[PDB]
């Protein structure tokens, strides 16, 4: 039951218009400084893989990874940058969709 909702949230985040920065892991060879700054990278396809394996024991673990995506986003990108702007839309989407399930 706790896993069923995450399947919905993740499917909705995957297809959201503002999801394009977060569908695959950041390629640190292409982003000067990323590895130095972001110690725990996270993205939607990693969460999708972990969910497929069943590696989420609880609903809160899924939420921790989701928040980590947007913490990393706000750590590295300016709020007015094109990736920052998308991260805020996705972050607000996740929080508001999380709260109508829990
Ligand atoms: C600033 C760099 C950064 C990004 C970023 C910048 S551009 C981009 N991608 C990701 C993948 N995407 C795949 C294509 C190919 C397939 N499709 C074609 C139909 C369209 C999309 C291409 C654009 N990701 N994301 C994050 C979290 C960042 C940081 C530093 O936090």
Curated annotation (Swiss-Prot):
It is found in: Nucleus, Nucleolus. Residues 1-101 form the Bromo domain. Deacetylation by SIRT1 in late S phase enhances pRNA-binding, allowing de novo DNA methylation and heterochromatin formation. Acetylation is high during S phase and declines to background levels in late S phase when the silent copies of rRNA genes are replicated. Expressed at moderate levels in most tissues analyzed, including heart, brain, placenta, lung, skeletal muscle, kidney and pancreas. It comes from the Eukaryota. Component of the NoRC-1 ISWI chromatin remodeling complex at least composed of SMARCA1 and BAZ2A/TIP5, which regulates the spacing of histone octamers on the DNA template to facilitate access to DNA. Within the NoRC-1 ISWI chromatin remodeling complex interacts with SMARCA1; the interaction is direct. Component of the NoRC-5 ISWI chromatin remodeling complex (also called the NoRC nucleolar-remodeling complex), at least composed of SMARCA5/SNF2H and BAZ2A/TIP5, which regulates the spacing of histone octamers on the DNA template to facilitate access to DNA. Regulatory subunit of the ATP-dependent NoRC-1 and NoRC-5 ISWI chromatin remodeling complexes, which form ordered nucleosome arrays on chromatin and facilitate access to DNA during DNA-templated processes such as DNA replication, transcription, and repair. Both complexes regulate the spacing of nucleosomes along the chromatin and have the ability to slide mononucleosomes to the center of a DNA template. Directly stimulates the ATPase activity of SMARCA5 in the NoRC-5 ISWI chromatin remodeling complex. The bromo domain and the PHD-type zinc finger recognize and bind histone H4 acetylated on 'Lys-16' (H4K16ac). These 2 domains play a central role in the recruitment of chromatin silencing proteins such as DNMT1, DNMT3B and HDAC1. Belongs to the WAL family. This is Bromodomain adjacent to zinc finger domain protein 2A. It comes from Homo sapiens (Human). The lineage of its organism: Eukaryota, Metazoa, Chordata, Craniata, Vertebrata. The chain holds residues 1797 to 1898 of 1905 of the full protein.
